[PDB]
Amino acid sequence: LIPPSTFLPKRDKNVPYIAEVQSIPLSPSAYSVIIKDKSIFETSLGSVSMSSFLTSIFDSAYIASLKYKSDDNYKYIGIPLLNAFVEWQIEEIDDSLDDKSKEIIKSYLISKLSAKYEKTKTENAVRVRLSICRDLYDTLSSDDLYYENKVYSLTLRRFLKAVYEDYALLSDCERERLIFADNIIKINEVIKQNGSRYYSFIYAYSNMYSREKRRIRLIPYRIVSDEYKMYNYLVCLSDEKSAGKEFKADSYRISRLSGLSIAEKLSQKEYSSVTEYERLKEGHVKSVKHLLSDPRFGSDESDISKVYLTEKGVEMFRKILYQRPILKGNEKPKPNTVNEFISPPIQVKYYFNKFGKDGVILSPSDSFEEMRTLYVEGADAYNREVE
Amino acid sequence: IPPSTFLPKRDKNVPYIAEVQSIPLSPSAYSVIIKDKSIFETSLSPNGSVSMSSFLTSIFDSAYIASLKYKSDDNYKYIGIPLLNAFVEWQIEEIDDSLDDKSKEIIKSYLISKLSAKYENAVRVRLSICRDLYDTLSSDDLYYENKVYSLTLRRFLKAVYEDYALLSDCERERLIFADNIIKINEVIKQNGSRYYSFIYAYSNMYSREKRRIRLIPYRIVSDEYKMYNYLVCLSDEKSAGKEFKADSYRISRLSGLSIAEKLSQKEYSSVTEYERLKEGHVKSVKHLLSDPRFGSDESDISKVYLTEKGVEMFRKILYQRPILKGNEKPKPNTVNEFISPPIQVKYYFNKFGKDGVILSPSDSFEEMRTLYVEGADAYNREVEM
């Protein structure tokens, strides 16, 4: 006769909280994506419990939805907006519409999201046991999930299944931004404070260029994905490469930063190394621009690699775009000749390692010697299976 | 007046010349489409090819007809064909028919305006427009697409192929094999609950050469990996023509699908009692609906020997990394079974050398052996004075 409003009832805060367990039935495919992401995250950061990992995903996705039209939504730039969260999808409705039109659109959205996450699937579901911590309990019992309560008809099981099934469908780089949301939020705060003036740096811990964590100074510029949606990078100025002495453009995997500090202002000597007339110097701008377009390999150095391409090699070069290196002045490669690549030698090697005789890396000597070893030992392995 | 359609109506009295449209695709979309094309081609006769234009045209034709026919009398034909966000007609027709006209017009305007805003270092893909695609792109049957993409063909086609590339493997496979799916759906509708009729089909499923079998379709389902779609059916293959038994066929390994013929009364009485599927067939079919692949699909497993170093490289190199059997962790210094397409295993382990040796299938082994043996000879030759 009178329905509850929230997924879970408000708890007596006077009584100690005891964590209740919710069983979430996940598709084998969603479970296996979450297992993979969890053991990859752990290598950053041991062990994290499945509950903690599922809670991080929920917390990140939720705060981006809740704060979508917030005054401080600059904090959540790049945090994915999951289809399972509904607040953002209501707030996205054209603000210029009359109230009656918005109510009709709101009902159209609630009904279509209900139908989508209410479709019974034929599957062998994996029972995933989420322990609900006090902070998650208070979120799931709050009034701040109004539209989710309506879409999922007050059924926590349905809501959480939808969150984790949607998580599992995101690209690698999207899933990574949910997992490392806390790094992204602190970076977004500093980018806003700094604008174009780059008054301030943050301290951060990096194992990007070291086995042990180094405390370095970063001047953030922009977070980007590679073009294949694999990894997120902070393009920035860093003092790592000169070991504290001066700031140079670089690109850090967001997964290899931790323990980010509040922004502190640079000293006038240091501010004058970075900026002139309160703008990033031409040299920093140029280097940053190179890293925005290639945030994996832009960070390495422009040395010559000599590669002999056959006719077949040029045809393979034309068809295989993944991490494909460039010639001088972005020329087309020439068949049956030595071609000069100016991309970092490591990227040339990662491209032509699958070409064998159709893409023979002649130099530098390093690349020649690694390819010769890979191929001679590989050949011996394949021949061993025949004889 | 001013243009109404993506392309103007052509004078049909003039011989047709295919004009080429340059479509700027994200590197990620292009890489998904060239992989799909290579994998589709492995369904054809040994050395067989499709042009990029033909492959992109098939994707467009499948996605389009599912959108156009979403509410039609014969929409039974398109059950399971993905409805791309790039196509708009279905999204207008999906509006709850029970709403008053004013509410529907408000939702229609909300959808047109929001889809306009959403689809407003590319790989330039040169799509040759065949006569039938030209006549579609110049028809009035893209009313809402013309509004959403402001009459700009480049924008519409980019949206189609970017959305294609975002689908799961099994969704993309259902657009590519739509013609098989449509013929299967026709027979599912005709049969309903009575299963009166079978179709003949050719299977690459359980033979090296195409085998002519009889199928009673039940339902198309995806495996637990969202990799391949299976027709769950009854089939006469296992008893070699003698009787119908529950089975599962990759829709990618069915071809030459015939008209439905009615079963003979001896055969109909093996399959049904009182015009309903016998409990035994129901029970076997139910196991295959929840897992259509496990312990029926043995066909194109890749055997790869990984060293300790191989396992470390497997852990670190995620790009197009193939799926193990049951999604197990790979094991060092032993043969590992990969259930990803043989092409994807080969594109992953071609850079592993002795740390990732593809032992089977025979084709993969012989290509890798040739790549490595001829590669070694090329690198060794450069050390000779």
Author numbering:
A (entry chain B): 2 to 46, 50 to 391
B (entry chain A): 3 to 122, 128 to 392
The authors write:
The Type VI-D CRISPR-Cas system employs an RNA-guided RNase Cas13d with minimal targeting constraints to combat viral infections. The Ruminococcus sp. WYL1 (RspWYL1) has been demonstrated to significantly boost Cas13d’s target selectivity and RNase activity (both the cis- and trans-cleavage). Specifically, the N-terminus of RspWYL1 harbors a ribbon-helix-helix motif reminiscent of transcriptional regulators; the central WYL domain of RspWYL1 displays a Sm-like β-barrel fold; and the C-terminal domain of RspWYL1 primarily contributes to the dimerization of RspWYL1 and may regulate the RspWYL1 function via a large conformational change.
(RspWYL1) by the single-wavelength anomalous dispersion (SAD) method. Each asymmetric unit in the crystal structure contains two RspWYL1 molecules, forming a diamond-shaped, ∼95 × 85 × 80 Å homodimer. The RspWYL1 protomer comprises three domains, which are arranged in a triangular fashion. The two protomers in the RspWYL1 dimer spatially arrange side-by-side, and interact with each other mainly through their NTD and CTD domains. On the other hand, the CTD−CTD interactions involve 16 residues to generate an interface area of ∼1300 Å2, accounting for the majority of intermolecular interactions of the RspWYL1 homodimer (∼60%). The NTD of RspWYL1 harbors two RHH motifs, denoted RHH1 and RHH2. However, the two RHH motifs of RspWYL1 are in a single polypeptide chain and fold together in a pseudo-2-fold symmetry, highlighting the diversity of the RHH superfamily. Our structural analysis revealed that the WYL domain projects out from the dimerization interface of the RspWYL1 homodimer, and adopts a Sm-like β-barrel structure. Within the RspWYL1 homodimer, the relative orientations of the two CTDs differ significantly.
